[PDB]
């Protein structure tokens, strides 16, 4: 395989060319959340809107705990919801034209990769069990 990832630096504080307060970032991220944007998109729009590194550095904690604190939690986590959305999209395309055997293969693979994460989420019990992908 290959490596391509971020390299979060050695410092663990706000990078001191910052010229902005702490709760203003909280207001910005709850504003984007009430606009209805997913947490990873909050993270990139906060990397580029005003110069934060990420919220665990600039605020006191991560965006998932700060959105659960501000009351805008997601009922299912990001990767779970995105794999479900990809699964239903490729299922809709295959039911448009059933001859796509590569889409059948990829639907089986996405079903496996979502049942693995559903097994993890049920065994850690952060979503309510009986949840087994419809």
């Amino acid at each position: 395989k290959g490596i391509s990832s971020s390299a979060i630096p050695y410092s663990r504080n706000a990078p001191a060319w910052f010229k902005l307060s702490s709760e203003s970032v909280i207001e910005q991220i709850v504003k984007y959340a009430r606009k209805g944007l997913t947490p990873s998109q909050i993270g990139v729009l906060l990397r580029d809107a005003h110069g934060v590194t990420q919220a665990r550095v600039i605020t006191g904690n991560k965006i998932m705990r700060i959105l659960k604190s501000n009351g805008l939690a997601p009922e299912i986590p990001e990767d779970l919801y995105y794999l479900i959305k990809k699964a239903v999209s490729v299922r809709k395309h295959l039911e448009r034209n059933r001859k796509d055997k590569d889409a059948k293969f990829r639907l089986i693979l996405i079903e496996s990769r979502i049942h693995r994460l559903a097994r993890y989420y049920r065994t850690v019990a952060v979503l309510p069990p009986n949840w087994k992908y419809e």
Binding site: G36, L37, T38, P74, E75
Partner: peptide, 22 residues
């Protein structure tokens, strides 16, 4: 820019409330 119509607890409460009402 590319908001979701789902995936938030309060938004799916609003969606099920709209389905309950009409």
């Amino acid at each position: 820019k590319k908001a979701k119509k789902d995936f938030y607890r309060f938004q799916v409460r609003e969606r099920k409330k709209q389905e309950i009402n009409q």
